[PDB]
Amino acid sequence: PAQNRAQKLLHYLGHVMVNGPTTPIPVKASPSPTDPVVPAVPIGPPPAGFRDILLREGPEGFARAVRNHPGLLLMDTTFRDAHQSLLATRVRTHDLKKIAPYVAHNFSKLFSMENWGGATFDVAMRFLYECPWRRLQELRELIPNIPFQMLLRGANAVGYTNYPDNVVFKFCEVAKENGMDVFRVFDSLNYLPNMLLGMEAAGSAGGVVEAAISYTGDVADPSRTKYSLQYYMGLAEELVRAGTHILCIKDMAGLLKPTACTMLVSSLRDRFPDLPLHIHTHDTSGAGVAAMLACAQAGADVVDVAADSMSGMTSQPSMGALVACTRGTPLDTEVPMERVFDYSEYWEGARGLYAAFDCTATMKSGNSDVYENEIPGGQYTNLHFQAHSMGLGSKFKEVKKAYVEANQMLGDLIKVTPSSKIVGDLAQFMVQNGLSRAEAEAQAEELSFPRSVVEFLQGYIGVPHGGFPEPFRSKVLKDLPRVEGRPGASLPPLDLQALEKELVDRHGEEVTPEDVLSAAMYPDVFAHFKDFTATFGPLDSLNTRLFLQGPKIAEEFEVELERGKTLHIKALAVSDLNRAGQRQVFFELNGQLRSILVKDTQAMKEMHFHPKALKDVKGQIGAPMPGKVIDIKVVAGAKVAKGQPLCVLSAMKMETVVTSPMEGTVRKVHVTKDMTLEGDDLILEIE
Amino acid sequence: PAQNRAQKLLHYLGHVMVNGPTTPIPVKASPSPTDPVVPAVPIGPPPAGFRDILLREGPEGFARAVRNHPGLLLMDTTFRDAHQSLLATRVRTHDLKKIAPYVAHNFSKLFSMENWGGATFDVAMRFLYECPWRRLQELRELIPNIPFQMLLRGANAVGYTNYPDNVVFKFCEVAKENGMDVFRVFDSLNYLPNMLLGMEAAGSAGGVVEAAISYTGDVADPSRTKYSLQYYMGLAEELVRAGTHILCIKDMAGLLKPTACTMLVSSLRDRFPDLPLHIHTHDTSGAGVAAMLACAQAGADVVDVAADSMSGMTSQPSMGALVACTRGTPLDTEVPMERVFDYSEYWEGARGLYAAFDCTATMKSGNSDVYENEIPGGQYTNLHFQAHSMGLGSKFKEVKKAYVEANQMLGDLIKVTPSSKIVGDLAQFMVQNGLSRAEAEAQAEELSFPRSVVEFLQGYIGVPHGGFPEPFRSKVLKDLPRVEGRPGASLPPLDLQALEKELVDRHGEEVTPEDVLSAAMYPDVFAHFKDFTATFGPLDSLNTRLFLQGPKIAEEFEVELERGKTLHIKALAVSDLNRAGQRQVFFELNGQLRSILVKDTQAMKEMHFHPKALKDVKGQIGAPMPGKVIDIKVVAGAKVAKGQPLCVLSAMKMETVVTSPMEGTVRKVHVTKDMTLEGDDLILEIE
Amino acid sequence: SKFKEVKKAYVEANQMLGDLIKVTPSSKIVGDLAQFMVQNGLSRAEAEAQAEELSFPRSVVEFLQGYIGVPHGGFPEPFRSKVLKDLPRVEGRPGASLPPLDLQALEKELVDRHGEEVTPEDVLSAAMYPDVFAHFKDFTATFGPLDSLNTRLFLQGPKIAEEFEVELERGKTLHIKALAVSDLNRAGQRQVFFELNGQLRSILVKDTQAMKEMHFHPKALKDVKGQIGAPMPGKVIDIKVVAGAKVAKGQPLCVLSAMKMETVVTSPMEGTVRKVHVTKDMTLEGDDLILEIE
């Protein structure tokens, strides 16, 4: 088969010129017209770093070298969890690669760089249309000397549901083979059985196991008894007994006050004198720099930081602030400040390309109300964008109050992905329906809760500390199936060879083990990603502005496909609509005229949505959210029981089962499969 | 005379609809369409505060009460220097008054609130067209219980030049009569003779004298010998001997590292156990919260903070962060966090009205390069806007480097207004002319330096620590007059009664002592302010959006002129241009049609700019900056000596004397009085 | 685009009608028939052969009934008998059988409806042209003496900033300047601003062009004899039948008023009216479905 990359790229550029951005843009901001300036890099291999120790001496040798290090070690999250928080994980492989050689040379003493895990895996395929594994591989070649770190969920890997154990093990194996070094293993509820599986999978792969305790509450507040200092110490003892190489405290919201830092970290050091202590926080409160200095003074070996232009607010504390504040003390990081400035300078320019995703569109600074609401950095940005998309943007203060009430109703569980989303959906549901906590708990048998909340209460994410809230769980679930113990333990092993064969039969002989694991964790996303890249080619070759907005008429630019293969492209014109609903886009490619035809949907728009459900008529079932009808479970003339499934709506990437509020006969169904509904659109009538 | 306020306001609104904003807008951002939500205030008088102690027991009683306070006292800079830093001092009296009753009730324990210092005085009259004294009086009425604080320059009051001593004394007297309580007395060079005059003037008025030492350098760095710990201790001893009630450390740039905080503040406490210590910083580095916590732990009694939405970056540290971090410690501020949140929320909304002036248009976060460049918060924002206006915006990195070089060339003087501006002009001049420091020092006899640099070298701002840089000063000044000692000491007393009579003759019998002092300090600004308010009336009654952008067609709004006198105004239409170059604007006012005639310069605005100076022809004198010709000192046929004044240009609010580079005969003058010149426009020819 | 075919059909229509003199209104009668023939793709022969089945225009029917007098040589037979069927025929002079109009009763009706300024000229104008005269009085009651305006102002109105003079009576001139037109208010009106004799005056006038929005669903299948389409664009004046009514062939079904001519739509078949798709005052396009017959 002849490769047609250049034409596929021109087809993408022509598609963006006719139809607009293929990635959903949350705010009316434009990318910077200027590409970021890459700082000068020395000619040669980078200096030896902590990875060279890890490769020579293994995970235990690396952990001893970290503990024995004189000073505060630093780790870079800019690559992942700094943008996850600030720009909705939209930073692309293109921009990461440009600065990677500078990082390798000037930051060779970093403990690790956290460029992988969390939301980056799904987001790369679904929204950036790039392979997360190729990003890892390319970056690994660029940074041969710094350990790569990922955020791993213990029994779910990087996915949103539980997987069979053999998928989690095979994912950690293939991640290590592809150059992942450190696995930060956490659970969204600190549910030890999920963490132990992820630790065993990462350790069996030959990775550095970093067991991460998610922090919530306040250990310095004696009124907060559920998440006390004793809770954290007891969980640390179980994770150390399970053979963690490094112990992490993951403060996903920025709740660690300097006094709580001092108390928790000194207690952990006194208990575990030889174990490396890694502290992660967010600067959401504007106190994260002070919190990390207090951790370092209390005997933390490592702290998470971001590049200064990618720090603060819902991100990590500033790298330059920590380096400057520790300079000339026993905690000196030995990082030259000039190198931090050049690094932040590049990201300041690069962040300008992502203005369309920047959290500063909605949040101008850190906010201390995080000590009340306990909303994690990445959840705050997402919950605001969701509230605005649902017409609740003016009520976002009510949504934050309802988030506290929803956390309590759910039982004050730790709030990190996906538990932070479960609390967020419940909070939006309460505000949308005008319901206080007491009303929502009283009516729990009558209300149709968000799927996530239902799946949580069923046990699909593990068991929360202190157990599930009763009688609230029993009222919501009724007769719905309950998962006891670890949800992955009852799943049959996935046949990865059968899946590989299915993928080869579909996409041809170029299917890799990484493709099989991507399909195993994210089947619909991976299928869409392969179909999209089959149509549009290697979009990672485009600069971020051209990827997001396409070229302007008469704009000229270069695209490097491979070393020594540059495309000189100029956009010339877009035609009027032809009789086939297509517009012809004209380009110059390497001094030659080229034309591609792209269909325009925005050229003509005309839908109609008549149905409406009277709020006072119990038999009229309205759509509980804007969404697409996936499935219709009933027909006209069918008898239905109270709580019986009627239809399935798919909105905001969540199947919601619409259930009957009464017993009766379905008089009429007003909806069809694949129909798009607005809120309160009449689904069906019951008599 | 019949009052015509409503018509004057409609004339302003019609003027803004036809001609655009009367205040210069630096960035293409629009004010928020929504006014800020004012939090609920209790009905009654506010609780007793520190002012009640000051009024009962005098300045020494107040200082003892501050020292004896258990915990860390907090002061609010949001009213001034929080916006001075973030929004170019553009916050108006309208928005300050709306939140003032909430501040009085919920923050009654503040040490002080600092709203009258520095630029607010000039900016209120020149750009907001409001009386700074009326702001002070109104705010005092709404906040009877919290001490008001101002930033006072010692021998210059709030002005930009030195004044006769009787003007500085009379200013402090009338400021105290109008309800100013605390005078933060500083000098831009820490020049003790200027500080002593300001301390004596504030003390003689019956104010609380707070002597403020401006911080530069690093006391924790043993390589920095000029501004050592011994320098600060020696100056503190002289200011304590001079009878300061409170000692302030003013870190105008955010240079105080936590280690330097600990060392400086403990040394000051150990030497002065009974003296209140007040620490001011900026969060420019992102370390300001950690710096203020270190000061409080080292025995500071008071720290400067801003409301959370008005904190960080070039502003003060976050109030909510300091309150949260000190909670339940011996340093607890006793401020309820819920009250800080409600205060921050209002400001977030209010800051949205000032989006057109927000430093976030140019700086997205704090920057640690402040430890190298030492640029103060308000100077950073101004220097960037100036660099962009001069076409140097893409070179702002070169301007920051040249700022370090200019500081060294000038002798590493303290950098705060106006010395921070003097270094800024020199830095822009160096970058504009492509000069290194060595070239600028070598050519110092041939170059035409910025007036501010010349006036500094003459001694018009006082004497820098270590003296002026020689031979550089002697080369720049040549035969220009030098001021020895204190510049105000040689000025004859200003006849304030003669000035009052001149103002009564020109403006009528309503001239107040505040008007006389405003004219004495700022004659041209005050004259323009009186002429503008005579035309357009009380613009402080308009909300900030209507003040900046005017009303939209068909927009309806309310204007309260006085208690129980509301104007209901609706904008209806704007006509085409009449034969007199005017456009008729139609309003409804209290249900009645009203029409005003407003001119539109924008329509006919045309001009031509022919002159140009060949860079290679020494006899062709080009304009060194865009500016207006104020004065022409020479005619065609005149003999001119090298260095002789040729013309005076007035650009960026700075008279620049253009001087002859050679001896010769003026062949031709190409410019006229009031002519606007671009850069390099030919002024004259010399043979 | 078919005006050449219309001119040819005018010759054919004149012959079919009997080559009568062609002047108002007989020239219009030939013109309607010619347009009807071209619109329906009919030759003279086909139109004469199908004369019992076709719904001819009203002017042609009223001519054949004798309402304009008797043509030289008499009416064309059998064509007249086929078109008229059982329709009433006027013999002799049509005015001779009309009862005298009571002009004093009409004068009193006009005084009661328009006030005491009714003249003998107004009575005769109403007697000859009742609907036109009523509309003319209502229009001039609203807008005043439009004969005082120059033609350009009458047809197109003034431009913005245009100044002009209007003489109402000898020595009574009104200098008038148009100043502005506002946006649409919540009542569907736009405020127009004038200067009148140096004084600003404002009038609130409604705009229909602001939001016309109509829908036209009905259509008559040409092959379905029971589907009765509108024979022309027109307004429904009257509906003579209801759903469930038995109708005979040639029975009146509705009255359309288009081009200033009431056209009676008649049944092409005997049957039962299954459904009526139109309402009184409804505007129809050509071929819009009026009703169904089974």
Ligand SMILES: O=CCCCC[C@@H]1SC[C@@H]2NC(=O)N[C@@H]21
């Ligand atoms: O729009 C759909 C969701 C996109 C991913 C959101 C990520 S999942 C990781 C992180 N945790 C959350 O609760 N949200 C973000």
Ligand SMILES: O=CCCCC[C@@H]1SC[C@@H]2NC(=O)N[C@@H]21
């Ligand atoms: O545009 C002209 C200057 C406007 C005032 C600038 C103020 S003066 C106080 C502060 N210090 C500076 O250097 N700039 C600001």
Ligand SMILES: O=CCCCC[C@@H]1SC[C@@H]2NC(=O)N[C@@H]21
């Ligand atoms: O638009 C409707 C008809 C307007 C009058 C037409 C006149 S009546 C006198 C003359 N004879 C005709 O056949 N037409 C014109």
